[PDB]
């Protein structure tokens, strides 16, 4: 599945920590669940 960030915006995620490339880009709280 996508990370919490790509889950609210739906931008698909690569599933990598700490922050997915999408969170380190827009600088957001990357969380998982
Ligand atoms: Cd993501
Ligand atoms: Cd994220």
UniProtKB/Swiss-Prot annotation:
Protein name stated in the entry: Lactose regulatory protein LAC9
DNA-binding feature ranges: 3-30
Residues holding Zn(2+) 2: 3, 20, 23, 30
Record gene name: LAC9
Residues annotated as binding Zn(2+) 1: 3, 6, 13, 20
Role summary: Positive regulatory protein, that controls induction of the lactose-galactose regulation of Kluyveromyces lactis.
Places the protein is found: Nucleus
The organism's place on the tree of life at top rank: Eukaryota
């Amino acid at each position: 599945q996508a990370c919490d960030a790509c889950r609210k915006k739906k931008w698909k995620c690569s599933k990598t920590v700490p922050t997915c490339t999408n969170c380190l880009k827009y600088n957001l709280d990357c969380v998982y669940s």
